[PDB]
């Protein structure tokens, strides 16, 4: 009856809506079997202390699923890792909704953890989705590399491997590196004249102000920048017509909470009509066995879902991260912010407003400028040569 579904959240205000949400959930799929309970504690300061609490409080109440959001005030320096670890033992699925840096994506260091917020690696899918219909194919890639740097390019290649086409070189430089202008000549001396960029805010600003003297900006020098490069302090540095970017929901955790609890309620309503459900233990103390009803839960959480929530239609992929995310293409036009259309996901729908490419042109210049490069190479042999 008391199918506890905890949710470690932000300050009390952001946790307030849960007790109102559970009543709606308790009423929609109502019966004398799904009388849920809610136990929650905010993101405590430090990390080890909260890791104690999640066993001191949450599984000490014998919970069945965990929901986690981002800390309200600080940055992503101390995102909750131990939740994926403390719940990592019993193999219970854990649902995140806002924390996003693409490290959590692979189900190898975090076993089982699905997110309703898509990591930045999907920009590569979006980048492909529009570079197909833009009359250019050859592309130059620039990115840092801590963990995400390899991920974006590797996904871009997993996409550009079935078309027998290949991109150009990728320039991997350590995060937080200045005076990196040496590689700009090496990239410039090549036919392709479109650039892919992705880095942290400070790194983007450094490699950004380290390019004006060198004439990387102008017509035929279209730049590719994601929300990481645009959102932050690097806003007041853009050229005349760079490609902005922006997501739909952002800080709208209420709708995410509603959709997540609806999906979880449907899944647990199916689950209650299943085989034996192991009673969750007293918690961390004493017992360290294996919760046999762990992967069974994610066996259906990963699949299906298909709920109709406020955020839209959620569809998780084979490895957690959802699919079919609506998206608002942004554009910077001389220190201004205007959109170009709506990327609903897997369908390209830009509007017919005014767009400006770098250099002020409004056209589709070739991915590689001019022509007549090809180099002959033979070997002295026979009357042929």
């Amino acid at each position: 009856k008391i199918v506890n579904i905890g949710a470690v959240l932000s300050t009390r205000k952001h946790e307030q809506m849960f007790r109102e949400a559970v009543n709606q959930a308790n009423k929609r799929h109502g019966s004398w079997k799904i009388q849920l309970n809610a136990t929650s504690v905010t993101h405590k300061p430090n990390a080890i202390q909260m890791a104690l609490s999640v066993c001191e409080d949450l599984i000490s109440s014998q919970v069945y699923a965990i929901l986690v959001s981002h800390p309200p005030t600080p940055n992503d320096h101390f995102t909750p890792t131990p939740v994926s670890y403390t719940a990592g033992f019993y193999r219970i699925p854990v649902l995140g909704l806002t924390t996003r840096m693409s490290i959590y994506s692979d189900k190898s260091i975090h076993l089982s953890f699905l997110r309703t917020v898509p990591p930045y690696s999907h920009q590569s899918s979006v980048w492909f989705e529009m570079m197909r219909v833009y009359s250019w194919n050859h592309i130059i890639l620039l990115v840092s590399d801590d963990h995400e740097g390899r991920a974006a390019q590797k996904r871009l290649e997993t996409l550009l491997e079935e078309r027998e086409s290949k991109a150009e070189k990728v320039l991997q430089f350590d995060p937080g590196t200045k005076n990196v202008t040496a590689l700009l000549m090496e990239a410039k001396e090549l036919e392709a004249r479109v650039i892919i960029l992705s880095a942290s805010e400070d790194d983007a600003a450094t490699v950004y102000r380290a390019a004006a003297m060198l004439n990387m900006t102008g017509s035929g020098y279209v730049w590719l920048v994601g929300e990481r490069e645009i959102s932050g302090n690097a806003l007041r540095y853009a050229p005349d017509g760079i490609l902005g970017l922006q997501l739909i929901n952002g800080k709208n955790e209420s709708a995410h909470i509603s959709d997540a609890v609806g999906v979880v309620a449907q899944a647990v309503h199916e689950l209650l009509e299943k085989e034996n459900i192991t009673d969750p233990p007293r918690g961390c103390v004493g017992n360290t066995n294996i919760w046999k009803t762990g992967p069974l839960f994610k066996r259906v959480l990963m699949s299906s879902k298909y709920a109709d929530g406020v955020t839209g239609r959620v569809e998780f992929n084979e490895d957690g991260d959802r699919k079919f995310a609506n998206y608002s293409i942004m554009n910077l036009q001389n220190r201004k912010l205007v959109q170009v259309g709506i990327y609903n996901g897997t369908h390209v729908i830009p509007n017919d407003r005014k767009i400006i490419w770098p250099g002020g042109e409004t056209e589709k210049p070739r991915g590689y400028q001019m022509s007549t490069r090809l180099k002959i190479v033979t070997i002295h042999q026979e009357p042929f040569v």
């Epitope: 009423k27 109502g30 449907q266 309503h269 299906s304 298909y306 109709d308």
Partner: antibody, heavy 122, light 107 residues
Framework: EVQLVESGGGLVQPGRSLRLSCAAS????????MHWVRQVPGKGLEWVSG????????GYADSVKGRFTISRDNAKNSLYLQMNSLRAEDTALYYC???????????????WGQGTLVTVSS | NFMLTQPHSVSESPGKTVTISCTRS????????VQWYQQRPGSSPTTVIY?????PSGVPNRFSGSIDSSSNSASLIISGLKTEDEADYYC?????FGGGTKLTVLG
């Protein structure tokens, strides 16, 4: 547009099985589960069954055990709640219906089909 | 289980408000979403009010919803007019339908 087309309403001798087929048109079928409510001459309706958006989840009300079964296919856009061993109480107005979501535990109802007459008597 | 409560039939002239109440006997009325359904004679049934206050897309307002428990009851209120307000009203809360109400125009 949203419309649950149903036909094949007629008279069947009690005890014999029946084969009903309700088709759809317009909206996308995948994102919605299909309900099965019916009225009866002289009284109101009662919720009976709901088939999941693809398969697996099937729910029944208090008196829907045994011959009162549901089935559906998501290939040729048909709904196949078929009846076997019918009795006199089964003579009523039958509607094939669809939930507002891919599940049916909420009993959310919209687009109330067209109606079919299954007759079971002497 | 539980049984709802709907009036057998009500009559109202055009230009006057009409009320149709669905009263739940066992359990809290608000504990389950009562859903008002309208079924015109000789036509496919339609929805009017669900989750105790909601109009479907395309419904020209004019249909409210009362969920005040009071004596463990709920009701549907329609603004005063009898243009096409002659049908059968069905209330459903959870797996159970009411007796039904028939509204007639005054001639």
């Amino acid at each position: 547009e949203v419309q649950l087309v149903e036909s094949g309403g007629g008279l069947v001798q009690p005890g014999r099985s029946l084969r009903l087929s309700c088709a759809a048109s317009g909206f996308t079928f995948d994102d919605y589960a299909m309900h099965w409510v019916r009225q009866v001459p002289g009284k109101g309706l009662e919720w009976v069954s709901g088939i999941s958006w693809s398969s697996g989840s099937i729910g029944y009300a208090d008196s829907v055990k045994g011959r009162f079964t549901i089935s559906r296919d998501n290939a040729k856009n048909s709904l196949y709640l078929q009846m076997n061993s019918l009795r006199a109480e089964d003579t009523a107005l039958y509607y094939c219906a669809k939930d507002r979501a891919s599940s049916w535990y909420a009993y959310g109802m919209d687009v109330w089909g067209q109606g079919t007459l299954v007759t079971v008597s002497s | 289980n539980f049984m709802l409560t709907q009036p057998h039939s009500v009559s109202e002239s055009p230009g006057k408000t009409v009320t149709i109440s669905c009263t739940r006997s066992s359990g809290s009325i608000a504990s389950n979403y009562v859903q008002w359904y309208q079924q015109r004679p000789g036509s496919s049934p339609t929805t009017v009010i669900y989750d105790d206050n909601q109009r479907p897309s395309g419904v020209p307002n004019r249909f409210s919803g009362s969920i005040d428990s009071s004596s463990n009851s709920a009701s549907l209120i329609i603004s005063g007019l009898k243009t096409e307000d002659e049908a059968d009203y069905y209330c459903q809360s959870t797996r159970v339908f009411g007796g039904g109400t028939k509204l007639t125009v005054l001639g």
